[PDB]
Write a protein that holds these residues in place. Sequence first.
Motif, PDB file in Angstrom:
ATOM      1  N   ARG A  14      25.127 116.400  21.056  1.00  0.00           N
ATOM      2  CA  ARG A  14      25.762 115.452  21.817  1.00  0.00           C
ATOM      3  C   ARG A  14      26.849 116.084  21.433  1.00  0.00           C
ATOM      4  NH1 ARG A  14      27.261 109.431  22.960  1.00  0.00           N
ATOM      5  NH2 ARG A  14      25.000 108.718  22.402  1.00  0.00           N
ATOM      6  N   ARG A  48      31.750 118.979  16.516  1.00  0.00           N
ATOM      7  CA  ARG A  48      32.634 117.719  17.038  1.00  0.00           C
ATOM      8  C   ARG A  48      32.662 117.019  15.440  1.00  0.00           C
ATOM      9  NH1 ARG A  48      30.580 111.816  20.222  1.00  0.00           N
ATOM     10  NH2 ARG A  48      31.500 110.944  18.279  1.00  0.00           N
ATOM     11  N   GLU A  61      20.399 118.799  27.289  1.00  0.00           N
ATOM     12  CA  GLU A  61      19.705 118.241  27.097  1.00  0.00           C
ATOM     13  C   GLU A  61      19.782 116.957  26.077  1.00  0.00           C
ATOM     14  OE1 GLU A  61      15.657 120.492  27.883  1.00  0.00           O
ATOM     15  OE2 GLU A  61      15.686 120.187  25.843  1.00  0.00           O
ATOM     16  N   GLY A  62      21.232 116.416  25.306  1.00  0.00           N
ATOM     17  CA  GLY A  62      21.511 115.894  24.765  1.00  0.00           C
ATOM     18  C   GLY A  62      20.906 115.258  23.573  1.00  0.00           C
ATOM     19  N   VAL A  63      20.648 116.979  23.534  1.00  0.00           N
ATOM     20  CA  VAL A  63      20.250 116.173  21.890  1.00  0.00           C
ATOM     21  C   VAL A  63      21.024 116.358  20.929  1.00  0.00           C
ATOM     22  CG1 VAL A  63      18.688 117.370  19.547  1.00  0.00           C
ATOM     23  CG2 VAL A  63      17.794 117.018  21.902  1.00  0.00           C
TER      24      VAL A  63
END
Lengths: 603, 133, 133, 133
Positions: free
Chosen positions: B88, B116, B84-86
């Motif tokens: 990244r 990340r 969902e892009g919550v």
Amino acid sequence: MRLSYEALEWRTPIENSTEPVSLPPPPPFFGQERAREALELAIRGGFHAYLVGPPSLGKHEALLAYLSTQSVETPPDLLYVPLSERKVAVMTLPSGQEIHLAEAVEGLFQRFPQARAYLEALRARLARYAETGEPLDPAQWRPNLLTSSSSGTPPPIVYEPYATAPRLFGRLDYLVDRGVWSTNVSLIRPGAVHRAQGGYLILDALSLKREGTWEAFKRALRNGQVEPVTEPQAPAGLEVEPFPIQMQVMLVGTPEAFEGLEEDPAFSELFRIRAEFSPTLPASPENCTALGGWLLAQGFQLTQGGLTRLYDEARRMAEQRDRMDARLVEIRALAEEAAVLGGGLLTAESVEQAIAAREHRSFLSEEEFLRAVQEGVIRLRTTGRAVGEVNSLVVVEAAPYWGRPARLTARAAPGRDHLISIDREAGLGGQIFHKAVLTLAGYLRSRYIEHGSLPVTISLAFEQNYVSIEGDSAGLAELVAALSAIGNLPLRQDLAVTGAVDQTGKVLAVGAINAKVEGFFRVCKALGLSGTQGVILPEANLANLTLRAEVLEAVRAGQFHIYAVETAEQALEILAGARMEGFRGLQEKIRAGLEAFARLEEG
Amino acid sequence: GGWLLAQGFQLTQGGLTRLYDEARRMAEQRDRMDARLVEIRALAEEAAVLGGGLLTAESVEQAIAAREHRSFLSEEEFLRAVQEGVIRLRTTGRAVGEVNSLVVVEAAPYWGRPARLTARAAPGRDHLISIDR
Amino acid sequence: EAGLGGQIFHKAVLTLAGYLRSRYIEHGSLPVTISLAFEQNYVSIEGDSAGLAELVAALSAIGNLPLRQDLAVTGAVDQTGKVLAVGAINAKVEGFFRVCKALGLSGTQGVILPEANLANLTLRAEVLEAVRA
Amino acid sequence: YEPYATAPRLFGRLDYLVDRGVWSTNVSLIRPGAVHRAQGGYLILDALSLKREGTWEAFKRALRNGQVEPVTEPQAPAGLEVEPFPIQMQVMLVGTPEAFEGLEEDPAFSELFRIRAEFSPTLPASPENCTAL
């Protein structure tokens, strides 16, 4: 990017709102496929299982429903017999048949091949009593029937919420003729463990811990040691032999209730099947329909519009446009309040008004805050422009977690590369807050390298904050405030700002995004909407935006505006009303501010 | 294999082989096997149920899978947030100063995830800062 | 620095340093060390309401500006030099009145306080009457 | 209204008649507690007493399971079993924001006490409230 009313609207359209809903009850565990498949395995294999998930999910009611449908062969008759005057054992006979042994012994391996050793001792005591006239007595020689049943459908199902030793393991009564002497096999009462034989025992993890009965319960499952509880008074005791445990145990609790249990190796050895309930379900037409048949079976008079508003409130509870809160007990408690406001009918209006009245009942703290703002005791601006200043958004740390603007300032002076959070240095921030500040310093120093290290000291302060502040969600507001202080850029005060930022200047998702937006709306509204107010927030939060009706309507009316962004520069361009490049843009103004500070710092 | 037969299992060669290799994987050592016979037995008990009383290669692999499914809620949440892009994350392309590092979540059964990590460099006086530290 | 202030007191001090450094930038960083002390304070001191008095004292020390001692000062200050509301505003005013009165009213004594506290001022009769006089 | 929320005051008490040792069951030596007296009507308790008296968990069991056990003595050589019953009463708990604090961390508190009735520390200073006072 601007978010239009059409992009923000998330609610389910309602057709024929007042029509009564008529739908069949869903299966126990609908939308909970993980827990359902774990517990199918536990039932097929005879394994013990533990049901884990947040409070108010309805885990107990669902388990009891599902167990009711099982079938087992009719449980054996269950009894204590004496093996002597000081010693007893728990035994099973095939069903309904201790009535024949209880009458046979009333004749004070006949036809009962299992009662082997109780018979020897009945005979042996009959023996040595011919052989002495050795008195009665009384008799404490006949079998004690603990349980018996007519069939195994459903199987025995015993939920004991209060897991004390006498409730799990049973109790000794003492008859008093002289002192407290009172043995007899027939004064022993059964506990839940006895009642669950052949079927299921359900216990709560939090009670085994609170009652301190986990170690004894382990001994019961591992060794068959089931001791009825004695009193400190009794001058002798009965020895109670262990017995073969025939039962499946289901433990129920939250992730937190299990926590101490899990550190025990024997917990994982004994409870091999974890049946974990999800806190949310897919927001699908099938689960909306299941929730409707579940509420009808609970006894509500539901209309279509009442169902639809409950379903959408469950979505908003989950803060996920595509997921609904899975806590059926909480949906039910909200429906009970709505039903009262609808005079017994659960309608769209009675649900929206129940939601409103819950908010009114918890609103004293916000009514105080908004009065202080209106009286000028708290100084906030919701219009005009100011350099180095921004309305950030915070959530108050007490339930139900209202959102509020928090005015934040950044000041820049010539100095040797320091980015100071006053609140962090005073000890008000937590670790994640401090992280967000360091992350911004990392961004600024690496972004602006033509002077060598940054020629400025920047200090950031939340203006009227008295309490500790946590989390990273003020990072975007602090970084825009800082860039504004460096380039002397007036920023709109009618737009509040929320968002975390990484070292690279990208904007990351934050928590409580709906409460934050609505908190800025409520303050703008209490001060008189100007027509141009709004919030800039992370694009990464679009999967979470489920804004209340009043906000959506203001945005549809043009009286409130939502902007979603990917980078901190995009937020700055909106707040400063200009582009970073096409220069005379903002970037040139930022570098000219840093040149001016650099000149001041070296004479 | 002789220990499991004496415990009463109906074992096939392929059921034995998969149990033995799962014990190797449990030990995280290609040349060593987990010595915990009680844990091998508990896994064989679940496999036996899925094989309808026979311990086969398939019933062992499917028992292993179902243990993973039963503990997978936290990863199902994480992967949905990523999708969902919550959260990244990037799994393609190129970027300066950025790398997918790998971490293990601190609750059993210790799933792994990318994390990340970024590094930024500026002109300055010899400092290597971990923000998280 | 002696450990008598709490966290909000310390915040008010940092906030004033922020104000002064950003307000006076023609020399580069401020060419002064300024120390502030409550003269006879023996106990811990908390809150931000001495910020205005500390900032005026500091500006006075910098410019050599004689200040009236017949006016007491209460008020918090932000980084931008604006004056914010404080708590206990009536007790503070009346405490300065009682001391001026015990020492003999001169006719010119008084208090400077935040405009933002006007919704809170409910001064005792004796004070209102002195101000009317 | 039972301000003193001890187990015998909420749930009642067993008396014991002594003919021989301490044998003394009988249904007719059981005294009622506040819970019995409030059936059909209202029970009012103070949050601070349930906590001080340690009776919150037993009181939860009463509301959730209808387990209302009159209090026994450590002496009694046998006991009566007391079956649970259908609770018919509405409970009002009263306390300060601080008295509720520990209670609120319990999920079952919010489940059982759904309606918060919060009093404001001040009222509008209006002619109507002057007249009401």
